[PDB]
């Protein structure tokens, strides 16, 4: 009856209970990294789930299945980050921090709906993504994963994945199981290192980390995955108060649990908090885990552990029923969801695809800087009718040339980012995706510059190489005289010095955390050059995460942000740069001047004496939210519409917005609450609404704007989430920047 | 009886009997602390003020004829913050700071300095100082580093427990003794961004771990009174943090002393940080947390009677705080002798012979030699006249010698006593700081102690900084000077040897002036780099209030020293160690980062990372916890453990067997290092917990007893409790806290 697809989902359950072996129940614990080996995992362990299954270990561990005794289905789960990460030709979109600069949930929900579709056609049924960890320390190496430094806009964002992700549910063929990733914490550990100590209480924690993952685990994310880090001295994986008082007490959550890689096991070797892997696994157990991922010898310690007492097999138990009653949710007993090569060959790297990842990065460029050099010689169209073709030479332009520099220019690898391709974590891609399926900068202005016009290419710089530990490690590169000097030389036989500079893998993701958060190598030393011939530069940063740029950056003729920005970033910077789209970017972060000028996030926390560091100014050098267009419009008359509020009202505003100047604008109208006077220290504002408004030149609109007074809320000293009644101020405006937000008083009482 | 007069009766009777007698006005006056300049005549008769500070010697006399026209006569205190030495006093000692004399790794030297400074104090008819500081150094852009004892809890508690012990004296009772303070609790030092008074991301147990052990130290050998500092803690004011307040300082620790804020914390929580909506809440929330004195928010005294009157507060909590404020008074003997000031002792004790003694001796044992290619001792090594205090002779082979000292700090009086002296900006009174005499520099140093055939030169090859009005008071770092710097390169090109003073300035120092960069500011890196590059040898002095980021040309300089703002007579210290007229000594208390991007680089860090470097950047540090030079070579060998089975009661014994294998002799600093392999909750990776000086001649080897209380092998587990956990443990024993510089021997503690 446990194969019976009329008997309801509870029965079957303590049924196949009943016909496992205890080694088979810890087995549908298990999560095994399938690179090693597929008959191993499925048969001598009895594994409930395989990850990083490569496309021939699928269709083997489907086959291995049918030797087995009671067959139950695997889940199989892959990292598919932004795309489908280590599938050879997938779409590769932008990475979650540049995605998140589109500020466009509908658009990134269509990015999570591609990627599904891709995903669910090679077999696979679980992805673990999103990531709703918060970009709050900059030298933290997985930044780049992030969808920035706000909690607002980090669960928009996320909401918008795991929906699109999860399909109309778990009965959808394209739809995937989302996880909603690094609960708790995870990304502000001491020095910005990696699974370093969190020094969090649970007030902090409650205030800046949870908000997102309360959303999803609302909005019903399938899945949840356990940070690596420890806070307050107790690891994730342990901590009871996280994964009992909250996420099952307090939020009700009832999807499944998962590890991260090995945290049973490195509470043994690497936090020392557990002397053996037998009572490493016990506390796992203890704590409420569901899914165990990579620890292969939880299997012998799991079963020493309920063979000496210390955990009793009720608990395995636990575990075992929420696990299968995932699988038999999604028909896997009866459609174990096989890779389908005809549905393959349909949909994977289809052009409806291509122009979903065309789309966001077109609207993930931000423009940081610009002293009216771009749009490059006024402004570009293509031939009338064809929204495909090279652009016309402008009026007044015949012959221009445009030097394309700096080690990113042409550079697919650096330019799709961690989690894609060759980046490390899969073993059956070490060539990457087909470098014809990426368009570089390069590549970008060749096939878009006019038939009269000339792009030139030089490497002006390298980065870093790799030497052994001097006790694998990093050697930056030293400034190369001849190097700079060829690229210095294109610069003076051109007209524009397109220069693509930023880090690349060795500096990013696991365990390469940054403490100087500056250019690497030669590309400071290249700027420098390149400047100084006075051929205007326009500074393209493709880059996990914000960098300190150099001076010569700042007196660069633009600066554009760029952020990883996938297969078509290099046709989205041509286009941006020769005014062939208009710039709608907005940061989701933002950037320093200095390491030490952290914390640089915009919602601070109210506090200091003095607003100045004696040797640096306090300002980023970049704030969240800013960005320009290739056009000015002024905010006017905010107002809000009624001043007097209860604990369940709307707070409603009208902005009015004019394009003054000669092209159509997509603007991003940001709303900041902020709690005037506060019992408890608070962020002097936060981020709780935006719009996107669309403004052809001389337009004018006025702006409905709302926030729910239940969304003004701040934590007390014991952790409540509440409305406190007061003053509040709206602050509206096209940044976080103060002296660019009007302002409205309002108030809450009761 | 009248008894609270009667000396015969006990303490506690006493302030029974004052109490009794007080009205709720002069309760309440008793727990104010009040600026003295402000005018003395309202505060004490009007306001019925406990306390005064700032009081100048007009006031001062003033202030006494005042408490003779009131009611009660109850005696003022009168308090002065005291930093490293009477800051405020013109001709007064002034030491290094309280990071240089951590440097010297010497309790019983820090206890002289302490009571030097409290005989000097004492004359003045101060009864009370703010010092010392319990700061922990945990985020080198902190303004206040220079306050501190460093970066580890262990020798916090052994500095500030002998602060203590040589400011109080032999009991209160003691006329040369006065009240001691422990300063900012708690948690006052690791803010965000290492900002002044921002936000603490601090829980229960990081408190309890790294920051309360010197407090509950120094509250259990008995410090008179504690003291406030002003950040916000997970949110909540410390000033209204009853938990610390209340339930650790009292509940757990049984502590009886005064409790009072910092300048205007309850005023602050009104006007500043918008907490409190009023006064009258702003007292009542200050009193149930458990302050005793408020310190400069005079509008406390209608604040706290007018919340007594509304039952915000009852009064029997304002009598608790009088209790403990009368309790103070009576131990001084302040009702039978108030200590005035007495200026026949004053001209006999202030900047004595005895205190200036003192001072040099912790000057020398201070400075830390970080590097040396073997320039130093300069010429071989120097010797006095057979006159020990006095030039130094030419040493066999050197008989005309150039020494060009250059740098901004090479002749700056001011910059050389650092933060919480002198003209350092919180007393409007000493405009001119102390007289240039008093103090020695470097430049000073070296035209006094070199021989007579020897030539000193000078040039300032740089400068620092100049200031600018904000875009509306803001640093603006001064250019390279190329005829500057040209200046000093001719000194050095015509010199045998080149000593640049390098480090920071006020500007760069202290509340509201946290730095984010800790590098060298204005033209110091580029008159380094000139002066490496001339061929002369280079000794880099850094004179500067904390640990810098240090430019390529400095480590590749022929020899590095760390002087800390080494007080009046750091220029003699300095030119005596360049000479070789002293062994080197010092040892560093707190670790140097080589980006501010690297922190933390304190030596305790919490095991956990996925990694051991950064990316771009190696963790380790510049300069380590416990490092520093002398001139000779020691050799560290056979670390054993005496017994490897202990029980909770029992001390782990160890021996190590040092050698000096060199020709000079040394005072040579053992560090005992505990390392608890398992822990129950993640925990520092090795922790001090106990060194030792041991004297070793030429030639000499020597066998060190070492032990280690078992009762201090602790963590902070989850529930936060403190306690011994039963394992395994290791014992780490060295010059050092760099792991390939400590042999480790293992233990077990049985619980
Ligand atoms: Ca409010
Ligand atoms: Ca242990």
Request: overall charge negative; charged content about 20%; proline content about 6%.
């Amino acid at each position: 009856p446990y194969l019976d697809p009329a008997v309801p989902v509870a029965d079957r359950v303590e049924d196949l209970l009943a016909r496992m072996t205890l080694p088979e129940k810890v087995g549908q614990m298990l999560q095994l990294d399938a690179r090693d080996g597929v008959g191993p995992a499925v048969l001598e362990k009895h594994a409930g789930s395989l990850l990083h299954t490569s496309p021939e270990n699928v269709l083997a561990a489907h086959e291995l299945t049918g030797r087995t005794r009671l067959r139950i289905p695997l889940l199989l789960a892959e990292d598919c980050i932004h795309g489908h990460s280590f599938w050879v030709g997938a779409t590769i979109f932008p990475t979650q921090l540049g995605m998140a600069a589109t500020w466009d949930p509908a658009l990134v929900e269509q990015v999570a709906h591609a990627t599904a579709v891709e995903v669910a056609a090679t077999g696979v049924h679980w992805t673990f993504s999103p990531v709703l960890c918060i970009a709050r320390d900059l030298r933290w190496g997985r930044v780049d994963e992030t969808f920035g430094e706000d909690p607002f806009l980090i669960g928009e964002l996320a909401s918008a994945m795991v929906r699109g992700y999860q399909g109309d549910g778990l009965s959808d063929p394209t739809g995937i199981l989302a996880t909603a990733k690094h609960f708790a914490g995870y990304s502000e550990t001491q020095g910005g290192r990696d699974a370093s100590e969190a020094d969090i209480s649970q007030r902090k924690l409650r205030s800046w980390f949870l908000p997102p993952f309360e959303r999803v685990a609302r909005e019903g994310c399938a899945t949840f995955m356990l940070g690596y880090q420890s806070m307050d001295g107790v690891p994730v994986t342990v901590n009871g108060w996280l994964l009992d008082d909250v996420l099952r007490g307090e939020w009700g959550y009832t999807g499944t649990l998962v590890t991260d890689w090995d945290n049973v096991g490195r509470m043994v070797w690497e936090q020392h908090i557990q002397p053996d892997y037998v009572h490493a696994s016990a506390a796992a157990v203890r704590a409420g885990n569901d899914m165990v991922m990579t620890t292969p010898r939880f299997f012998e310690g799991a079963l020493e552990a309920v063979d000496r007492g210390l955990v009793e097999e009720a608990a395995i138990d636990a575990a075992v029923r929420r696990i299968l009653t995932l699988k038999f949710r999604l028909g896997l007993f009866e459609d174990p969801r096989r890779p389908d090569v005809a549905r393959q060959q349909a949909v994977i790297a289809s052009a409806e695809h291509a122009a979903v990842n065309l789309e966001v990065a077109r609207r993930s460029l931000v423009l940081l800087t610009n002293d009216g050099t771009l749009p490059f010689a006024g402004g570009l169209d293509r031939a009338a009718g064809t929204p495909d073709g090279r652009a016309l030479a402008p009026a007044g332009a015949p012959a221009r040339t445009i030097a394309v520099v700096g080690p990113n220019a042409d550079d697919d690898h650096t330019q799709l980012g961690d989690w894609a391709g060759a980046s490390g974590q899969a073993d059956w891609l070490p060539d990457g995706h087909p470098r014809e399926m990426t368009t570089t900068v390069l590549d970008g202005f060749r096939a878009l510059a006019p038939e009269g016009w000339a792009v030139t290419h030089a490497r002006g710089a390298d980065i870093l190489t790799l030497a052994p530990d001097p006790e694998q490690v990093v050697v930056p590169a030293a400034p190369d005289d001849a190097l700079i000097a060829e690229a210095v030389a294109a610069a003076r036989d051109a007209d524009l010095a397109v220069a693509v500079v930023g880090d690349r893998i060795e500096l990013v993701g696991e365990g390469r955390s940054t403490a100087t958060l500056e250019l690497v190598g030669g590309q400071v030393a290249l700027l420098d050059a390149l400047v100084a011939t006075g051929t205007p530069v326009v500074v393209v940063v493709v880059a996990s995460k914000p960098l300190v740029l150099p001076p010569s950056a700042h007196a660069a003729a633009a600066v554009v942000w760029a952020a990883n920005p996938g297969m078509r970033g290099g046709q989205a910077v041509a286009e941006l740069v020769l005014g062939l789209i208009e710039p709608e970017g907005r940061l989701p972060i933002s950037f320093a001047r200095h390491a030490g000028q952290q914390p640089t996030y915009y919602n601070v926390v109210r506090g200091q004496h003095g607003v100045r560091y004696a040797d640096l100014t306090q300002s980023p050098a970049f704030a969240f939210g800013e960005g320009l267009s290739y056009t000015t419009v002024e905010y006017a008359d905010l107002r809000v519409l009624g001043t007097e509020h209860g604990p369940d009202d709307v707070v409603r505003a009208e902005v009015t917005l004019t394009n003054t100047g000669s092209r159509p604008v997509r603007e991003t109208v940001q709303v900041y609450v902020s709690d005037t006077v506060t019992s408890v220290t608070w962020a002097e504002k936060e981020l709780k609404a935006y719009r996107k408004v669309d403004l052809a030149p001389g337009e004018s609109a006025t702006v409905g704007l709302e926030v729910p007074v239940a969304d003004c809320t701040l934590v007390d000293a014991h952790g409540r989430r509440v409305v406190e009644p007061g003053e509040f101020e709206l602050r509206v405006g096209p940044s976080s920047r103060e002296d660019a937000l009007l302002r409205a008083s309002f108030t809450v009482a009761g």
